[model samples]
Target: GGFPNDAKGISGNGKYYSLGQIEKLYSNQFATYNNLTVITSDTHENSDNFAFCLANGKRFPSFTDEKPKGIYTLVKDINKEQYTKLLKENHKWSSIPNLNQAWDTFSRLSYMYLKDPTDIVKRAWGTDLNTARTYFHQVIQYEIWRYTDGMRVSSDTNVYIYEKFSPQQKKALEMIRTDLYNFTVPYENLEYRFYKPDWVFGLGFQALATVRWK
Candidate 1:
């Protein structure tokens, strides 16, 4: 029904899909980060190496026609570099309190992925895969959308609670337990690993339980 899924479909090399072709196939993967263009594609050349522009306005390999391999190798290298800088500049993040927790959560999540293979969820959270490849491609795209956002810490004041927070207090201690209680994950083995915030945001979901709210 669709075009031939062969080398001729892309650059006459049935094995490799060009970056442009991959982009079209997975249009949703193209997202912006801090006003920069970022691409996530296999390029058939580097099954491992995913390519995208970082927020710093730099592309890996520094130029075109370099070559392709596993994109994760580059991603890991860049993630490590960014993580190192974040630690060295920890003072900036520590002051915010919530963001600091994000750093902790993000670091822990990354650590889990590295230390254990079973930690990887083979399926997308809460979604069944009949035509899963499209969504799967999207996952890789967003997964590549990292270091630029770098463990973001945002609060939805209205997601729950009517009380105004001082912006410095930690509420997760009061809220996280219930967030998990009300939280629902249809998919199995969905480790609550990458939901933007598992420890910090999830922590605040139960804020009203113990509050006087008077």
Candidate 2:
């Protein structure tokens, strides 16, 4: 299966996978901010970034991106510069509240992978080779899909590409959590390090959660 949404079906590396079938998958890393779901992926790529707004568009300037939003990069369908200015003035630069708590949650999650991944995976995926790679990939993809569900914020941030929740992201975040500091890895990390909210529509939507995984 090729990329369901694109003709070329290329990853950042220009490699094509039928349906973008990822080998290593991870689950979404989620945190309840103001009752909304905030999440991200754990891969070094930081697919979603997790710097985002509340479920009701209450937060402002959740994050920013440098490169133009593209499918390989998350929100390729957006007009980045315009989106940023609009959201900034209307949300953060204006009366809208900033969800730094959410951002902090995201940052903490990234620390897990940066600080310690090998240790946690010993529990989630054991020590298998293919199993570990597939596990991690799915884990990261799951978090990416969760953050882009378009539940809150704007449709502009909906998964503009074939982005969807994968079993992988959940696993990845689970493997990394060491208590104390955690956030939706794919979503949080994506925004925090790689993506910009305005640049990618799907990259902009966020949620507020109270309990349970998303």
Candidate 3:
């Protein structure tokens, strides 16, 4: 299951590995690919919103000062302030005794735990307005809250909202692109995405390598 590394396959795949490579690498049963001629690789690459989609195989700890990436550098420059503030204001976000908010956000995004009843919710990273509310219920209702045990809350809290789509309460926060907890600053004003795992498949099993642009 990988992009092909051949000549004709390269051209057919466009500048990157051809859709054929990806198809040949994996079975078509679980995936599908489609051709995308109207949108050239360059057009999508140069768009204002896009930064760059690095080739796969990036591990978290491997990013050190010596191997700084443009995206990482940018994120560092911008998100530091926002992330710091979240930890300072919210006890849950600051699990570190100093910064445990990191632990909370990681657990929440990975479906381990829900936010404290009193804390405001932060949508997962890579989420846009279209995904926040719907995806929340889709993730929680199915996996986390199958029974009453899934319904536990802090005693200080007093509201009972038992529904799949209850993320509607915080859909307004889809604005955050990073997984960092809620900070007062406007999303546009913050910089840095905590991570970007490029596992998105754009079309079919392999007819076209409609690579993701953002």
Candidate 4:
């Protein structure tokens, strides 16, 4: 069945809803709970309300529920130019080889190293290196979304190369991780509301999330 147009309530019997409708429901519940008026003129308040819903309203809570402690504020201190400069200056993996170059290099190297021990080592090391490179790109992209687009990119996989990160890179990663946690936790809770019970959508979502993180 299609999503309901009326925003009264959701059918627990596996009815689908639109992403916009679900987000609206969450925003309304959040405003009512906090006793706050969502003023269109007050952009900051609207941003805060959106941030709160993204951080804690995934379950579509009742209007009577209390606001969660520590209001979640949108990260806006870092501007696009500043963040870009920071990454270019401090991050080592900020710019990786383009897709064509990377693919050609990797395939050629793997073929050249097609021997016993060396091939085995190349297989292991190449996979890790390429995956790490992709992860680096994903992190930077997510950070851009958080800072510039004011949207948090949902992430399921965590990169564990913190030891190799410079101080500035580490700080940037922390910011992105925090934003990811806030957005993903609640967003995932509301995921089932928008999909059919028997739908094979998890595979697509998983692939998108995992590949981006990889």
Candidate 5:
């Protein structure tokens, strides 16, 4: 079951192979495609707000909170001053330890783990609002695994969102597109523009191809 390759069929029960391919593609992406488009409304929302939710829905380990305890306080537990330095000052974004673990943890958490993910995301990135917002976006995008985690199908497939996107929303979508093309598999194909048209179908196409070659 997969996307049709150069020669589409196999030897035994040719019809079975074709049907299996269709099933595989649909199975991989259909639920996710609808989750994005149906669970959230394109016309009834704000892009900045959506971006806020997307970015802040989880936490990263690059920076920590000021708390004396709790999950966000792990950096301070490991190195108190280094933790404070990040919140009050600035540090190299990529060189920090536990950064990868943070990505892993953020992916595992799945749903909201913070009292306010948006606020904490900003604080974890930087103190300055202007500076913080940019890094905050970067932090979420850095969760490279999230690209294949299925939720992207929503943002990629929800066409109505294009009609009312703000500059911030467009930028968020652009970031997702870049990450998908550069980081994820099968998604980097030429069929996708910066904004994927019928990304659900495109995603399934890639999934199908993977199975064919696997």
Candidate 6:
């Protein structure tokens, strides 16, 4: 049978499956599957790095090119109430008043430092921090999606691409990076408090949380 319309179809590396559809299949007990597991990290506690694996055996099938190696915890083991609570916590940053204002403060600072103010120059140089902020939000959303509906997971320092950023641009990037770090570090820490024990060997999740704060 094929996936239903509401279920999102994810395909890659010659593999295809609708996680939402499969989830429904298990819930209805249509297949012999008896367990619903989530592939996740033990060490990193990264909310973004998780995948649903439906199986009746100790081992589950891989659905992506990225190896599904990590702690495999039964979704049934999770406390739904607690998961919702942690999800609310992860989103606390978005509720902060004037968060965009804070981002604009950094953006304006970077804009002021552009030596070549041409459209192309602005697109390339002036938008680095903005791009980082967008990516930061995307990482957060991915993490939220992982916790909300188990999924998968997937940087760096100063100095703009080729040319050296002006002093103000450099300083602006620093502030933006620091601001992003302040939120990301705490968010992942919250994940650790809840999800760390299941991590294999307690070493940490292997994948880095996706936040481009350079």
lDDT of each: 0.24, 0.30, 0.25, 0.25, 0.24, 0.27
Put down candidate 6 lDDT per residue, 29-138, tens digits, no spaces: 45422112222332222222222221111122322333343332222222335434433343333342333342222222222222112232243345565443322222
TM-score ranking, best first: 2, 1, 5, 6, 3, 4
Quote the lDDT for 88 in model 6.
Answer: 38
**Weakest lDDT window of 10 consecutive positions for candidate 5:** 67-76
Off by over 4 Å in 6: 1-66, 72-130, 133-172, 177-194, 201-214
State the lDDT of candidate 1 residue by residue for 14-132, as single tens digits: 22211321322333445212111112233433222222222212122211232422121111222334543433332232332334343333333222222212212232222333232
Location of the lowest summed lDDT over 10 successive residues in candidate 4: 205-214
TM-scores vs. true structure, each candidate? 0.25, 0.31, 0.19, 0.17, 0.21, 0.21
Best model per lDDT: 2
State the weakest 10-residue window (summed lDDT) of model 1: 205-214
Model 1: CA > 4 A from native: 1-22, 25-44, 47-130, 133-214
Segments in model 5 whose C-alpha atoms lie over 4 Å from true places: 1-42, 47-104, 107-126, 144-199, 204-214
**Model 3 reaches what TM-score against the true structure?**
0.19
Please, what are the lDDT tens digits per residue for candidate 3 over residues 39-157? Answer: 11322221111111111112211112223111111122224455444323322221233243432332233221122221223434233434433343233322211121123222232
Considering every candidate listed, which one attains the maximal TM-score? 2
The local distance difference test score of model 6 is: 0.27
Better TM-score candidate (3, 4): 3
* Model 5: lDDT to the true structure: 0.24
Q: Write the residue-wise lDDT of candidate 2 on 1-214 in tens digits.
A: 1011112122444211111232112124232121011222221232221222222333222211211211222333222353343334334422323332333433433334333324555555555534544344333333322432223211244443224433443444555434524333333222222222333343342321111111
